[PDB]
Design a protein around this motif. Structure first.
Motif, short mmCIF file in Angstrom:
data_model
loop_
_atom_site.label_atom_id
_atom_site.label_comp_id
_atom_site.label_asym_id
_atom_site.label_seq_id
_atom_site.Cartn_x
_atom_site.Cartn_y
_atom_site.Cartn_z
N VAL A 2 9.21 -7.36 -9.47
CA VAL A 2 9.41 -6.02 -8.91
C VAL A 2 8.83 -4.97 -9.87
N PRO A 3 7.97 -4.06 -9.36
CA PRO A 3 7.40 -2.95 -10.14
C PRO A 3 8.47 -2.08 -10.77
N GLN A 4 8.27 -1.71 -12.04
CA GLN A 4 9.21 -0.86 -12.76
C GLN A 4 9.19 0.57 -12.22
N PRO B 154 8.54 5.23 5.62
CA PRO B 154 8.39 5.80 4.27
C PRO B 154 8.47 4.70 3.20
N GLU B 155 7.83 4.93 2.06
CA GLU B 155 7.85 3.98 0.95
C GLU B 155 9.27 3.57 0.56
N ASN B 156 10.19 4.54 0.55
CA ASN B 156 11.56 4.28 0.11
C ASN B 156 12.45 3.64 1.18
N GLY C 249 4.11 -9.78 2.57
CA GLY C 249 3.88 -8.41 2.09
C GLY C 249 2.77 -8.34 1.05
N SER C 250 3.02 -7.63 -0.04
CA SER C 250 2.03 -7.54 -1.12
C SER C 250 2.40 -8.47 -2.27
N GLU C 251 1.68 -9.59 -2.36
CA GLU C 251 1.90 -10.58 -3.43
C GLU C 251 3.35 -11.11 -3.44
N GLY C 252 3.98 -11.16 -2.28
CA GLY C 252 5.36 -11.64 -2.18
C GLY C 252 6.38 -10.52 -1.98
N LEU C 253 5.95 -9.28 -2.17
CA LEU C 253 6.87 -8.15 -2.05
C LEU C 253 6.73 -7.43 -0.71
N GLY C 254 7.81 -7.43 0.07
CA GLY C 254 7.87 -6.70 1.33
C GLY C 254 8.29 -5.25 1.14
N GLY C 255 8.86 -4.65 2.19
CA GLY C 255 9.26 -3.25 2.15
C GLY C 255 10.46 -3.01 1.26
N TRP C 256 10.46 -1.88 0.55
CA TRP C 256 11.60 -1.46 -0.26
C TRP C 256 12.79 -1.26 0.68
N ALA C 257 13.93 -1.89 0.37
CA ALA C 257 15.15 -1.71 1.16
C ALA C 257 14.98 -2.12 2.62
O1 LIG Z 1 5.58 0.98 -3.20
C1 LIG Z 1 4.50 0.48 -4.00
C2 LIG Z 1 4.23 -0.98 -3.66
O2 LIG Z 1 5.46 -1.70 -3.50
C3 LIG Z 1 5.31 -2.74 -2.51
O3 LIG Z 1 6.30 -2.62 -1.47
C4 LIG Z 1 5.47 -4.07 -3.22
O4 LIG Z 1 5.62 -3.82 -4.62
C5 LIG Z 1 3.90 -2.59 -1.93
O5 LIG Z 1 3.86 -2.78 -0.50
C6 LIG Z 1 3.49 -1.19 -2.35
O6 LIG Z 1 2.08 -1.09 -2.53
#
Ligand SMILES: OC[C@H]1O[C@](O)(CO)[C@@H](O)[C@@H]1O
Ligand SMILES: OC[C@H]1O[C@](O)(CO)[C@@H](O)[C@@H]1O
Ligand SMILES: OC[C@H]1O[C@](O)(CO)[C@@H](O)[C@@H]1O
Ligand SMILES: OC[C@H]1O[C@](O)(CO)[C@@H](O)[C@@H]1O
Length: 494
Positions: A58-60, A129-131, A472-480
């Motif tokens: 998970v991105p910091q 939205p991203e969040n 999703g992106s490299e295994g990461l789907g939507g936040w929440a």
């Molecule tokens: O929100 C920034 C990034 O976070 C993700 O949900 C996965 O880390 C990506 O879809 C997006 O590019």
């Protein structure tokens, strides 16, 4: 890919009657498979665990789901008896533990309360939205409601902890939660052991284009407290665990309702002992431990279990304890937030654990531990080579784990990236961020992580799971991202 070590305990997956006194064991032999799967050469800050059983990093730099209105952690969707997740009148609805954002993140547990969030249904994760686009609806309970059930009104703290939420075809919500009273001095020392109870409050959903509000939730029914025979009480253990109701219907048992929850084995803390079955070694195994060594090691202070209860009426206001379905004696103190997940005629028991809660001699990552069998009570087979690990935080098991408030110098920065994982339909897993970062550059979360995907029963093998890194992106789907797969329409408007 396995370091030399003990063989796992042979588990049969044989089903028993829900009322039988059979308790499956997650054994020391089983738990030692975690170290066998670990790469002993993994360098500082790299994951030592196999990628297929490791949550994507998970991105910091993460979004906050409530725009910092509150601290958010343990979350549950609205469910039916098959754990399908619901929208109501066009809104996805979730419940979360929340606390005043002004509190220090680590002090929030004794100020915990249940809040709810909502957002439009039917929007793809990439269009939102991203969040995640959730609106904080506020607290579920009016002040002074949840304190109802406690005879001893002298509590210093009164909280609502985790549970589940059932929705009927007619829009009624049955919120099963952990209702907790604390009796603490100003420094945190107990006056008496805390009082966690499994409880129920009934309310209704009101939803239209303006959003979602809730009505009811004015009465609390006290369902269960620890008994001392099956589930450890405060008198046996000052810091006993008893929480996290998850209700469901078992396909094998039509027309009844069951509940799993976290407990401890009902033994006096300081005289607890483990036996040969808890160790679970095959005869002659060169890596076998003795019962005397384990009992002398301190491992006896780790005696978590997963409990079962059966509803005595249709209103789900009366419950009967059944014997524990899983015990982790001398393995871990904490098998938290259990859920039963039904797939291909198997019963999957999923539960979460911390790294620090493992018994002496043992070690494993923070995250989701899982067990498969042919019934809700069965000789459960721990997943993935008998280890139990379904989904661990990236973790270098060769170095100290540190703490979420003080990450270890040599640890992967995602060691504490997620907790309170919950497995949703189709193996999507949601969770909250505790800590991300290195020893001198870390941040606290209190918001949900990206939803990830775990494929359950990989190959033709129901004992195996694997992270889907293409999701999703490299295994990461939507936040929440807590998506509904079922949709309801009801009278509730406001
Ligand atoms: O929100 C920034 C990034 O976070 C993700 O949900 C996965 O880390 C990506 O879809 C997006 O590019
Ligand atoms: O659901 C009730 C049914 O389940 C059992 O108690 C066994 O688990 C049976 O004795 C009964 O027919
Ligand atoms: O804050 C208490 C709550 O948090 C957990 O420990 C997981 O984060 C749950 O088992 C409990 O209900
Ligand atoms: O029922 C569909 C309608 O419900 C909503 O999801 C929430 O009110 C709207 O976004 C949509 O127009």
């Amino acid at each position: 890919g396995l370091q030399d070590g003990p063989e796992p305990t042979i588990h049969t997956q044989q089903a028993y009657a829900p009322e039988d006194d059979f308790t499956a064991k997650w054994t020391r032999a089983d738990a030692r498979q975690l170290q066998r799967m670990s790469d002993p050469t993994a360098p500082s800050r790299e994951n030592s665990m196999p990628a297929s059983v490791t949550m994507p990093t998970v991105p910091q730099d993460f979004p906050d789901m409530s725009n910092e209105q509150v601290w958010v952690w343990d979350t549950w969707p609205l469910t039916d008896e098959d754990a399908n997740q619901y929208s109501v009148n066009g809104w996805e609805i979730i419940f979360s533990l929340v606390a005043d954002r002004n509190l220090g993140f680590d002090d929030r547990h004794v100020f915990a309360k249940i809040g709810y969030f909502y957002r439009p249904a039917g929007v793809p994760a990439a269009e939102r939205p991203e969040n995640g686009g959730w609106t904080y609806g506020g607290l579920v309970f009016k002040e002074g409601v949840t304190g109802q059930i406690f005879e001893d009104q002298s509590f210093s703290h009164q909280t609502q902890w985790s549970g589940s939420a059932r929705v009927s075809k007619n829009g009624e919500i049955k919120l099963f939660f952990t209702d907790v009273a604390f009796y603490r001095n100003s420094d945190g020392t107990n006056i008496k052991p805390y009082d966690p109870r499994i409880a129920l409050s009934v309310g209704k959903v009101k939803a239209n284009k303006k959003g979602v509000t809730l009505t009811g939730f004015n009465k609390v029914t006290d369902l269960l407290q620890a008994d001392g025979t099956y589930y450890q009480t405060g008198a046996q253990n000052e810091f006993f665990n008893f929480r996290d109701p998850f209700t469901f219907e078992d396909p094998a048992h039509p027309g009844e309702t069951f509940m799993v929850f976290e407990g401890n084995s009902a033994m006096q803390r300081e005289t607890a002992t483990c036996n040969e079955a808890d160790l679970g070694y095959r005869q002659g195994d060169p890596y076998a431990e003795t019962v005397d060594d384990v009992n002398a090691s301190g491992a006896t202070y780790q005696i978590g279990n997963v409990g079962l209860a059966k509803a005595k009426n249709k209103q789900l206001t009366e419950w009967e304890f059944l014997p524990p379905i899983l015990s982790a004696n001398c393995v871990t103190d904490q098998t938290e937030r259990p859920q039963i997940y039904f797939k291909d005629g198997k019963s999957y028991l999923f539960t979460i654990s911390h790294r620090g809660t493992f018994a002496a001699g043992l070690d494993g990552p923070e995250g989701v531990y899982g067990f498969v069998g042919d019934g809700i009570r069965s000789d459960y087979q721990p997943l993935n080579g008998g280890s139990g690990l379904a989904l661990g935080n990236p973790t270098n098991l060769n170095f100290l784990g540190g703490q979420p408030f003080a990450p270890d110098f040599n640890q992967h920065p995602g060691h504490f990236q997620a907790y309170s994982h919950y497995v949703m339909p189709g193996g999507l897993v949601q969770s909250f961020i505790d800590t991300i970062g290195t020893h001198d550059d870390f941040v606290r979360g209190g918001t949900l992580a990206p939803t990830v995907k775990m494929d359950i029963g990989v190959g033709g093998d129901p004992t195996k799971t694997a992270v889907d890194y293409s999701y999703g992106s490299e295994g990461l789907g939507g936040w929440a991202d807590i998506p509904a797969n079922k949709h309801l329409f009801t009278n509730g408007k406001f």
